[PDB]
């Protein structure tokens, strides 16, 4: 079917999102969002992350997994642990992929930086990161800001039913 994404948690629940940023946090495009459910810092009871859509798995490492849709769009999930699938496996929307890591070393098993447990979520097409601007997730339109991680709610927000949800506010599926 047509590529459609859902927020990687259950209907009627909320997590929190930061502002849109590139995969590295510098430069363009703003392809990525950091999601967390507010469980706390390192060592806390971090949640399981659901596949935003169906597709074929690529497992890059113990902390880095991707779901590639039949359309060639894909979502990438970084800072992960307890990964449940291997290369070539098929998953459905909602499938539990793993947890986002509750330990600092596991979260950064391929490098990067982190201030606390979260999943770094990235949209790709043809294996290349692509901008989240004007893309949709759980029927929210994503409006990217004017710099990496920009959380100004006049610049960055999720919009559904004509109402905005800002970064660092309950984002309900
Ligand atoms: Zn990130």
Numbering used by the authors: 1 to 173
Can you list sentences taken from the study reporting this PDB entry?
Unlike Halobacteriovorax species that are intracellular predators, strain CF6-2 is an extracellular predator, which kills Gram-positive bacteria by secreting an extracellular protease, pseudoalterin, that degrades the PG in the prey’s cell wall. (ii) Pseudoalterin can bind to the glycan strand of Gram-positive bacterial PG with its C-terminal domain and degrade the PG peptide with its catalytic domain. Pseudoalterin preferred to cleave the bonds with Gly/Ala at P1 and P1′ positions and, to a lesser extent, to the bonds with larger amino acids at these positions. In the meantime, the released glycine and glycine-enriching oligopeptides from the degradation of Gram-positive bacterial PG induce the synthesis of pseudoalterin in strain CF6-2, and then the synthesized pseudoalterin is secreted through the T2SS of strain CF6-2.
To better understand the molecular interaction between pseudoalterin and PG, the crystal structure of pseudoalterin was determined to 1.9 Å. The sequence identity of pseudoalterin to the M23 peptidases LasA and lysostaphin is 54% and 15%, respectively. The catalytic domain of pseudoalterin, comprising five β-strands and four connecting loops (loop 1–loop 4), is quite similar to those of LasA and lysostaphin, with a root mean square deviation (RMSD) of 0.64 and 4.0 Å, respectively. H21, D34, and H120 chelating the zinc ion in pseudoalterin are equivalent to H210, D214, and H293 that chelate the zinc ion in LytM21. Among them, either H79 or H118 can act as a general base/acid in PG hydrolysis based on sequence alignment of pseudoalterin with its homologs (LasA, LytM, lysostaphin, and ALE-1), and mutation of these two residues to alanine almost completely abolished pseudoalterin activity to PG. In the model of the pseudoalterin: (NAG–NAM)2 binary complex (NAG, N-acetylglucosamine; NAM, N-acetylmuramic acid), the glycan strand (NAG–NAM)2 interacts with the C-terminal domain. Analysis of the model indicated that (NAG–NAM)2 interacts with the C-terminal domain mainly by forming H-bonds with the residues H133, N134, Y136, R141, D143, N154, Y157, E159, R163, and R164. The catalytic cavity of pseudoalterin is similar to those of LasA and LytM, and more open than that of lysostaphin, which suggests that, like these homologs, pseudoalterin also prefers to bind Gly/Ala. In addition, compared to LasA, the side chain of Q113 of loop 3 of pseudoalterin makes the S1 pocket much deeper, and may be capable of orienting the long side chain of amino acids. Thus, in addition to Gly and Ala, the deeper and more open catalytic cavity of pseudoalterin may accommodate residues with a longer side chain such as Lys and Glu in PG.
